[PDB]
C-alpha cells in the first residue's frame, strides 16, 4: 500500500530539519540574552515557513467531512451486468476510502447543520482507483452543472458579511428555490430527517445520476447506485441538531471514529437499479434528469457486495483533507449518461484539484495513488515526486519501440465508452421539455412519510421560511410548495401570517414509494454502539453501585455506557458540568439520585433534570431504575418509551427494546 | 473610501470576463438529450471560476470579521513620537479592523471559549501602520519559533481532528502543563475574557512592548490598550456553549448591526508610556509578552479615538 | 543509482491514466465520426491539463544550467578542524549532487554567453544535506545581500523590452558597475577568460564567502572553499564563444554529459583556506568581505577529498531542474560569518522555493531529500507526501513522551553556532570602513594575467562599453577602470574615442598572486575529451584511408575523433554543412582532402573557413600524409608556426598534434596594444 511505504515514525530520535541535520526548535538565536533574533537562525525559518504554509484552500463544496479506511467484498462474478473487474469473482476484495460530509458549510462548522450530506467512496481496484461521488439523498438540486455556482452562491453565506453559516435558512437560499423549481424534490429531502441523520453509519448512499455498465461484449444497460446501510435509518430531531452542534460539532466524525475504534466498523449493501436503454424514459420521467428516483416499485435492487468501513486514518490531514475524488475516475465496464448535471462534473473535478494542491501532480499524494502500476506520458509539473526512465514519452514513437500501447475495448484492457451510444441534432443550449415535471416525485416522497415525519417536514419548513425576511420571497415560496402540495403550503404560511394560495392540482397525486421514509423503516437492526447515560450521585453508594451494574450488563450488548456524576471518581466517565442529552441515545436515572432532580456550584442550576427532559421532549428511551422524578420532569409512568423497574434485568431488556425503536414519535404534537 | 474598485451588477446583460455577452444556465450540448461539449466556453469559464473560489483560511485566527472606520487624534503628539497620524490635533486616519477568535476553522462559532484577535490597520498619510493585537493583553509563550507547538497543541488532535474551535482536551493542556509560561493566558482564557459579550465589549492590546520615537532619535517604551467605550461583558458558559449551536455568526452579527443602526463601536486608543530606564524597574522583565504592566504603576495615556461605521460591501474581498 | 526507488519504468506495458485505468491518449473522443469533442472526455482532459502546467518558474538567477551525481570521498578524519561528519574519516564516501550554470540568462539562453557561473554542489551526508552553493569566480560583486535585485536588475534585460539577452553589454549594467565600485573585482573576473569557460570541467568552484570550520569542542576557524579542477583551467575565446551560442547553446550541457557517458567523469580536490579568528583583519582587507580573496600566498590550501561527477541525470525536470539549493542546509562542523552578503542568501533560497515549487514540501521532491530519517513537527502544506504517526507534534510533550528530542552542541549531534561567536554595538544599517577599498584587488588579478591574458580582457572591455549607447555612464565607466589602473581606462578609452582621465595613484601597485591565471596555468594535465575534428573527402578514397587510419590513433589516447566530409557514409561522422570550428579543440586535414580547400552541399568555402577559423581561435591545427603546403598556403597558415603540425608518419603526427592540445592555446596568434 503507498500509505505504509509513507508513513513517518517519530515515536524515537533526535529532531532534525526536512533534510536530516539534527536541530532543535525551542529557542530563537540572538545577538545577546536579551538581544534582537538573527537571519541567519535557519532552524527558526524553516519551522516557522513551515508553520505559515499549512493550510491549503478547503473544498469549494462539502468542506466539512471526516474519512475512513475499508473494504469492499464482491458477492458474485458480475460479468453477466458489467466487465468492471472490481466486480468480477466471488469475494474478491477490493481497498476502499469513504469520506462523509455536509456540503454547504466550511471546514469548522458543525456537523449537525441541516444539509444534503456526501458519501465518496474510492475503490482501489486491480485495474484502476473507481471513485462514486455521491449523497445521503438520492436526487439533486439542478438539471444542468453549469447552474451550479447558481446554487451554491444562494445556499452558502450572504457574500456581504459572510452571515449565516452553514444554513439554508436565509433569504438568497429560499429566493434561488423559489425561483428554480427543478429545486422542490432534494429541498423536500433536505428538509426531512434526512437532512440531520444520527449519524454517516445511519444514512444510505447515493449515486444520484444515471450510469452504464457496459460488458465486455459491448452491450450496457442504465444503473442508479445505493449503498443501503446495515446499521438502519436514523435521524436527530431539529431541536437535538440545534444542541448538537453547540454541545458537540465533532458529533459525527466523533461517532464515525469511536465505532471503528471499537470494532463497530459500519457497512452496507452495495446496490444497483439496473433497467434496460429502452427504459430511459419508460417510467413517467427521463432517466437523464438527476431530480429524479426510480420508485423501487419499478425496478428492485441488486446486491452487489459489501462495503466496510474499518480503519481510521492515520493522519487526518495527508488522508482525509487531501482525498481528492473524481467521477471521471471511471473504470472499464462502467460508462458515463448524457446526464447534464454529471457531464459537467466531470470538468470541475479535474480542474478544481488545481486549486486545493497548488500544482498538477494531485494524483501522486499517496491517498490518491492506484494500487496497480502507471505508464503514461504525463511529465514534469511542480511538486514531481517521479524520476521517469523513458525519454521518448510521445506516442507514435519507434525510439522507446512504441510503449506505452494504446488501450482500448481490444487491447489492454482499456476504457471504452459505450459502443452503442449516439448523438443526433443541432447543437444547442436548451433544456429537454422532458425534464419540466419538478412537482410531481416531491409529492410522491412527501405521501411516503409517516404522519408526524410530514409534520417534522412542515416544522422544518416553518422555521426556515420564518426566518426570510422579504415578504416577495415568502409569498414565492408559498407558491412553489403549493404546487407539490396544499396542504403543505396552507401548514407552512399558518406559521409565517400569509395565507396560501389556491389549490393547483396539476401535479397533485396519492401514490406512495417503499424505502424513503425514516420513521416507517422499522426499529434498528442492532444497537451496538448506541450511547446510554446513567445519571447518578456522589453522595450515595447505592447510586454508583446500580450504575456498576447497569454498566456490565448494557456494556456486554455493545453499547456505550456514560455514567455522570457530579465529579469525577472511579466508575464515573463525565460529570453533570459537561453532560448533555444530546450525548445519549438513551438516558436512565438510578434511583439513589432522586435528590439532584428536585443548586451545586459543580453545575448549572437545574441540569440533571434538563438532561433528562431534554432526553423525554426528544423521543429518546428514558428509565428510572431502583418514580417522583417522573413528576419532577413531567414524564407520564405509563408512557411509550419510560421505563420503570427494580428489576436490573427486566430493565435493562425492555430499555434495550426502546433503544431499537429509537424515537417514540408519539411525543409530538401534530396539526389538527 | 474603495470605491474605486467596485463593480456594480444592478443592471445589463451578462458577460464574460472580458465582456462579451453570453448566457450562463444551460450547457451546449449535441441534440437536446445529448452530452454536453468541450467547445462549451461559457460553462467551462463559469465553473473554473467556481472551482477555484476558495483561498487557503488563515493558519490561525481563520474565524473574523470586519470593518471599516475612521481614527481621530486628540492632540499633537510630536513631543513622544514622530508618528504621522499623531501629529495634530483632530487629524483623521481612515482605518479597517479584522477581530476573530484563534484556534477554529472557518465556519466554526464565535462564542467558542478562545483568545480573540483585534487587528487595527491606521491607512495613514505616510504608509499603512498595523496593529495586530488580542482582547487579552498577554501571551502564551515567550519566543515566536514556540508557536507552532502551542497552535499544534490546542488545534484538533491531527489523526481524526477533533475537537474543533476548543482547548478541551489532552495535548492543550498537556502543552499548557509542560510550559508553564502559558499560565498567565490561560487565566485570562478561563476567565469571562474568554467568552466575551461581542467585539464591541471587549478591549484590544498589541501585548508587546513597541517604541515611540521622536524626531531627535529619543525614544521610550510603550504598550498598547484600546479602550472599548461600550464597557466590558461577558457571556456565561452555558450560554456560550447554546449560542455556539443557535447562531455561529453572533458576534459578526452584533458587530453588523451595531454599525447599520448607527451605533458604531468606538474605543480610546491608549498607550502606557515607561522609559528606556524602566525596563526591569516593576519586578519583571518589559520584553517578556507574558507580563502586563501594573496601572498603578504607569497610567494610560489616551491618543485618540477610534471609531468603526462602515461595514464592507463584499466580505471576500475586503 | 541514489534515487532508484523514485523512477517509473515505461519500456513495457499499457498506457494508463495517472490512477491506473488503462486508457487510449490518440483521438478525442466526439459526436459522429466528423462531430464536435465531448467534454466527458477525461482521457483528453487530463492528458492535456498535465501539459497546460508542465512549466513551473525557472530560478531568478542561475536559470541556465545543467547537473550530474557524483561522489565525495574524504582523504582523512578533519576532526582536528572541524566535527562535519563527511570528513570524520579517511576514504569516507558520500553522494554528491551538482549543478554548473550560468547566471543572467533565461532558460534557453546559450551556455557560452559572458558571465559568472554558478558550482552548486550538494553532500547527501549522514549528519543531514549539507550545501555548497558557489561560483567559478572567488568574489562578488557587492557587499551586501540588499542590493542583489539592483545588481540583478541591471544586468538583465531592459524591462521595456526585454533585450539584451544574458549579456552584461548595455547601458544599465555598466551604469551600475560606474555607480556601485564594489564590482570592480568580479567584473574584472568575468571580463577575463574566467567568464568564458571552456567547459564545467575546465573551471574551479568558490564558496565566496569565508565560512567557520567548528570542532567538537567549540573552537573555530575562518575558512575559504575551493574546488580545484582536475582537468585543468581553460577558456574559449570571445569570438569563438559568440559562434558557439548560435551553433550549440548547448556546449556546456553537452560536454558534461558525453564526458559522464564515456566514463571520463569529472574531478575535483575540494580544499580550503584556514585561518585563525584573529585573522580576520590581518591580511590587508576584511574576512567579512565577499569581493576580496585571501592570497595563496598568505594562506595555502589544505586538500580535504575528491569531488567526482560519473553518473548523469535520467530526468532532467526531475533532477536538475528541481534541485533546491540553499546554504541554509549546514551541517554540524561548519558555521557562518557575519559577511552581509551571505547572511541575506540565508533568507533568499528558504523563501525562493516557495515559488518555484509552487508549495511548502520542496524538501520532498526525491532529489532534495535527505539519506537519513526526518523526525520533526512539521506538519500539513500543499503537496504533503508524509503520513506522520506522531499525533502529538509540538515541544514540549509527555503524550509521545518527549520525542523527538531536543538535538544541540551537546546531545544528539545537534547543529550549534560557534559558541565564540559575539556581537557588540548599536543597531545600524552602516557600512563597515573596513569594506571601502574596492579597486586594489581588481588591480592585483590584473597584475597576475600574462600580456596576452591582459589584452583579451582589455578587448572584452572595449567590445561592451562600446555598446553603451550614454557617454555619461561610458565616462563613469571610465573613472572606475582609471582606478584600478591607468592603462586600462587608456586602452579600454581607445576603442570608445573618448579620453581616460588622468592617473590616479592611490590603488596602484605591482603586486601578484599566483593561480588567478588562466594563460600561464600551464599545459592541461590531460587531454582525455577533447575533440579533434579530421576533414576529409568522398571524392578520394584515400582521404576516407588516412581518417580512418588518424581516429584509430587519437581514440586510443582518448580523444574525441569526428570525420568530417561533403555526405556521411561509414566512418564518416559529419557533413560540412553542420560542422564548425568551434566543434572542435584541434583541427586535421588529410592530404588525400587537399582539392577541397562552391557545392550544393555545404555553404562556399566552409571547409576552408572551418580550418582558418580553428587557426585564429588560436587551436593547434595541421595537415596529414606528407602533402601540406597547399591547405596551408590556402588558409595562409605559416608552415613554421607554433601549433601548426605537418607529418607524413600517423604516429609521428599525432605526437606532436597531442602536444598542441594539451598547450591547448597558441597564444602568439593574437595582436598585443603597442
Ligand atoms: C459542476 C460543479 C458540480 C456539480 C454539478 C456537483 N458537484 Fe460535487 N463537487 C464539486 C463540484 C460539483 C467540486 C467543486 O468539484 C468539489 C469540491 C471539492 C472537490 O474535490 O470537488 C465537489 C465535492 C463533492 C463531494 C465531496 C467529496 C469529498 O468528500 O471530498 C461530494 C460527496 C460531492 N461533491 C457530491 C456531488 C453529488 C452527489 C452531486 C449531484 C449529483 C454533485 N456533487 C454535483
Ligand atoms: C511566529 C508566529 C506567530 C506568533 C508568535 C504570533 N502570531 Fe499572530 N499570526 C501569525 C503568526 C504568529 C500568522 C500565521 O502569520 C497569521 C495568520 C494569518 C496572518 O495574516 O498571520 C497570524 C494571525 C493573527 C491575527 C489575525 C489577523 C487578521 O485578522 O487577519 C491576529 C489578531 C494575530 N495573529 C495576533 C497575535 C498576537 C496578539 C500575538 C502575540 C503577541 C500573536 N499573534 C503571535
Ligand atoms: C539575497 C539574494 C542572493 C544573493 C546575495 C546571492 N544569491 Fe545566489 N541565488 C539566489 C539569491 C542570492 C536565489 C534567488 O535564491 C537563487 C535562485 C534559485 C535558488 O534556489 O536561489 C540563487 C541561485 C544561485 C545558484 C544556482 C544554484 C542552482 O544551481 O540551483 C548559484 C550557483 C548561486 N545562486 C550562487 C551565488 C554566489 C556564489 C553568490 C555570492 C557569493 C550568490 N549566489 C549571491
Ligand atoms: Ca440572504
Ligand atoms: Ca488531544
Ligand atoms: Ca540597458
Given at each position: 500500500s503507498p500509505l505504509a511505504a509513507y508513513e513517518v515514525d517519530d515515536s524515537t530520535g533526535y529532531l532534525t530539519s526536512d533534510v536530516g541535520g539534527p536541530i532543535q526548535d525551542q529557542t530563537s538565536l540572538k545577538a545577546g540574552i536579551r538581544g534582537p533574533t538573527l537571519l541567519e537562525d535557519f532552524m527558526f525559518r524553516q519551522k516557522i515557513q513551515h508553520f505559515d504554509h499549512e493550510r491549503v484552500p478547503e473544498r469549494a463544496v462539502h468542506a466539512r467531512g471526516a474519512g475512513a479506511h475499508g473494504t469492499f467484498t464482491s458477492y458474485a462474478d458480475w460479468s453477466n451486468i458489467t466487465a468492471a473487474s472490481f466486480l468480477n469473482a466471488t469475494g474478491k476484495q477490493t481497498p476502499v476510502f469513504v469520506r462523509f460530509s455536509t456540503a454547504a458549510?466550511?471546514?469548522?462548522?458543525?456537523?449537525?447543520?441541516r444539509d444534503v450530506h456526501g458519501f465518496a467512496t474510492r475503490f482501489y481496484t486491480d485495474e484502476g482507483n473507481f471513485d462514486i461521488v455521491g449523497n445521503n439523498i438520492p436526487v439533486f438540486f439542478i438539471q444542468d452543472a453549469i447552474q451550479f455556482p447558481d446554487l451554491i452562491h444562494s445556499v452558502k453565506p450572504r457574500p456581504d458579511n459572510e452571515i449565516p453559516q452553514a444554513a439554508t435558512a436565509h433569504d438568497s437560499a429560499w429566493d434561488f428555490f423559489s425561483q428554480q423549481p427543478s429545486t422542490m424534490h432534494t429541498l423536500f429531502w433536505a428538509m426531512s430527517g434526512h437532512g440531520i441523520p444520527r449519524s454517516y453509519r445511519h444514512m444510505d448512499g447515493f449515486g444520484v445520476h444515471t450510469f452504464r455498465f457496459v460488458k465486455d461484449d459491448g452491450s450496457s444497460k442504465l444503473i442508479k447506485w445505493h449503498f443501503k446501510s446495515r446499521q438502519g435509518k436514523a435521524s436527530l430531531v431539529w431541536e437535538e441538531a440545534q444542541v448538537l452542534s453547540g454541545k458537540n460539532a465533532d458529533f459525527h466524525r466523533q461517532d464515525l471514529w469511536d465505532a471503528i475504534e471499537s470494532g463497530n466498523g459500519p457497512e452496507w449493501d452495495v446496490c444497483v437499479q439496473i433497467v434496460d436503454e429502452s427504459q430511459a424514459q419508460a417510467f413517467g420521467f427521463d432517466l437523464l434528469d438527476p431530480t429524479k428516483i426510480i420508485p423501487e416499485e419499478y425496478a428492485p435492487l441488486t446486491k452487489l457486495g459489501l462495503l466496510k468501513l474499518d480503519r481510521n486514518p492515520t493522519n487526518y490531514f495527508a488522508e482525509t483533507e487531501q482525498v481528492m475524488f473524481q467521477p471521471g475516475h471511471i473504470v472499464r465496464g462502467i460508462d458515463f449518461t448524457e446526464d447534464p448535471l454529471l457531464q459537467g462534473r466531470l470538468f470541475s473535478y479535474l480542474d478544481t484539484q488545481l486549486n486545493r494542491?497548488?500544482?498538477?501532480?494531485?494524483?501522486?499524494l499517496p491517498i490518491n495513488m492506484p494500487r496497480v502500476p502507471i505508464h503514461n506520458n504525463n511529465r514534469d509539473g511542480a511538486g514531481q515526486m517521479f524520476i521517469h526512465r523513458n525519454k521518448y514519452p510521445y506516442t507514435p514513437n519507434t525510439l522507446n519501440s512504441g510503449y506505452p500501447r494504446q488501450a482500448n475495448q481490444n487491447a489492454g484492457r482499456g476504457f471504452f465508452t459505450a459502443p452503442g451510444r449516439t448523438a443526433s441534432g443541432a447543437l444547442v443550449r436548451e433544456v429537454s421539455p422532458t425534464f419540466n415535471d419538478h412537482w410531481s416525485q416531491p409529492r410522491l416522497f412527501f405521501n411516503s412519510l409517516t404522519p408526524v415525519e410530514q409534520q417534522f417536514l412542515v416544522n422544518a419548513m416553518r422555521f426556515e421560511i420564518s426566518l426570510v425576511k422579504s415578504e416577495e420571497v415568502k409569498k414565492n415560496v408559498l407558491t412553489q410548495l403549493n404546487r407539490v402540495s396544499h396542504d403543505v403550503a396552507v401548514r407552512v404560511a399558518a406559521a409565517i401570517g400569509l395565507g396560501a394560495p389556491d389549490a393547483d392540482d396539476t401535479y397533485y397525486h396519492n401514490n406512495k414509494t417503499a424505502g424513503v421514509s425514516i420513521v416507517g423503516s422499522g426499529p434498528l437492526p442492532t444497537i451496538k454502539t448506541l450511547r446510554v447515560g446513567i445519571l447518578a450521585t456522589t453522595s450515595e453508594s447505592s447510586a454508583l453501585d446500580q450504575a456498576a451494574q447497569l454498566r456490565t450488563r448494557l456494556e456486554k450488548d455493545g453499547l456505550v455506557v456514560t455514567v455522570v456524576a457530579e465529579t469525577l471518581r472511579?466508575?464515573?466517565?463525565?460529570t453533570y458540568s459537561t453532560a448533555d442529552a444530546t450525548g445519549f441515545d438513551g438516558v436512565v436515572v438510578v434511583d439513589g439520585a432522586a435528590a439532584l432532580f428536585a443548586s451545586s456550584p459543580?453545575?448549572?442550576?437545574g441540569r440533571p433534570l434538563q438532561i433528562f427532559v431534554d432526553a423525554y421532549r426528544w423521543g429518546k428511551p428514558v428509565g428510572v431504575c431502583g418514580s417522583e422524578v417522573l413528576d419532577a420532569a413531567d414524564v407520564?409512568?405509563?408512557?411509550?418509551?419510560v421505563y420503570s423497574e427494580e428489576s436490573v434485568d427486566m430493565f435493562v431488556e425492555e430499555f434495550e427494546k426502546g433503544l431499537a425503536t429509537f424515537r417514540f414519535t408519539d411525543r409530538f404534537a401534530l396539526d389538527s
Open positions: 458549510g466550511s471546514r469548522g462548522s458543525a456537523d449537525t447543520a494542491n497548488g500544482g498538477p501532480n494531485f494524483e501522486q472511579e466508575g464515573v466517565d463525565q459543580l453545575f448549572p442550576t407520564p409512568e405509563d408512557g411509550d418509551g
